[PDB]
Symmetry: C2
């Protein structure tokens, strides 16, 4: 799987344009804002966008999803249904940061643990990883050993759990039981900061010790 | 000032019907839900409802405000503007607890620190007390030494500050600098649990020591 990271919004979130090398069929993961910047990269890359994927219901991951879905004529898929309250609360999310109103978002379909999403010949496995948000999912490409994981895990950190319905014990358990077993060699693209691997975090991440 | 407490919603919130004894002009503070229960008490009390007052933007304090405002033909007044994001997020608030959708609420006017609200011959002084929510206000009747204070202070407790834009240092400072100086003899009607006085909390509330 090929990809391009597109930093979007004032929160500087790692939106991912991902695509199959043979078919050039593509997906956007977490198009958080800066819809024009995203469109410019998508259009200049020459790929065929087929879908928008959402890891979780937070503003900096979903702000441009509705505009891009309409622009390209593609579905918005994900996250898990427990984040519906966050997506319904997008106006409140944006108003809290003094930003322009982000409209409520209803995805074409929710995702569940164990779902398959096809990006041309790339098969993404969906893993439900709650703790940061109760509906947070991640996308795993087994063939390229690549994880697109939103705000579950960072290089030397983990997602905040002090939000409504956040749960630290739940988040750490999800990382250890669902992510780490995918293998040390797995690279992850987090929502913020630099990329890292699961192996490096297993042994160096201060939140994953004990 | 006369009053009647009307426990509403599954959160068992202390909605207040308050009124002037001479004129029988009345106000509702925090009509949180159970709109029929509220209407039954208001109508049976014989008072003339003139206004709805809001201490803060949380679901269990505002759920029935819009229906009652329309039913009686009265304004919704308060809280302070910083809670606009909470009122915009009412659908998200209710969806989070698996309840029926509560619509976004736009009050007739926001309140500010130092505002006067007239309930017949009762003059309420408005105090801005952030920390639980950034737009939280309280209503003080100096003549009857009575405070209607929402979720700022409880008997032996204080409002949670772990919500988005919550701030514990700010909440405690607001209590100590804006509430306690009103006098030890002041009775308060909190959003939850039994009534108490400012004097008792000053000396016994574990959150107010030091
Ligand atoms: Zn993020
Ligand atoms: Zn309350």
């Amino acid at each position: 799987m090929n990809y391009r990271i597109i930093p979007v919004t004032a929160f500087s979130q790692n939106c991912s344009l991902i695509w199959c090398e043979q078919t050039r069929l593509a997906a956007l993961v977490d198009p958080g804002g800066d819809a024009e910047k995203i469109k410019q990269e998508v259009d200049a890359s020459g790929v065929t966008l087929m879908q928008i994927l959402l890891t979780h219901g937070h503003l900096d991951h979903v702000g441009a999803a509705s505009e891009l879905a309409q622009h390209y004529g593609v579905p918005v898929i994900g996250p898990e249904k427990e984040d519906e309250f966050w997506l319904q609360g997008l106006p409140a999310q944006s108003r809290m940061f003094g930003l322009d109103e982000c409209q409520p978002l209803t995805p074409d379909r929710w995702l569940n643990d164990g779902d398959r999403v096809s990006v041309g010949n790339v098969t993404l496995q969906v893993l439900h990883c709650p703790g940061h948000t109760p509906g947070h999912v991640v996308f795993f490409d087994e063939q390229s050993q690549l994880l697109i994981s939103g705000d579950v895990i960072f290089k030397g950190g983990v997602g905040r759990s002090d939000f409504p319905r956040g749960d630290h014990t739940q988040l750490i358990d999800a990382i250890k039981r669902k992510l780490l077993p995918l293998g040390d060699d797995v690279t992850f693209i987090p929502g913020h900061g630099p990329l890292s691997t699961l192996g490096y975090e297993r042994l160096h991440n201060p939140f994953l010790q004990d």
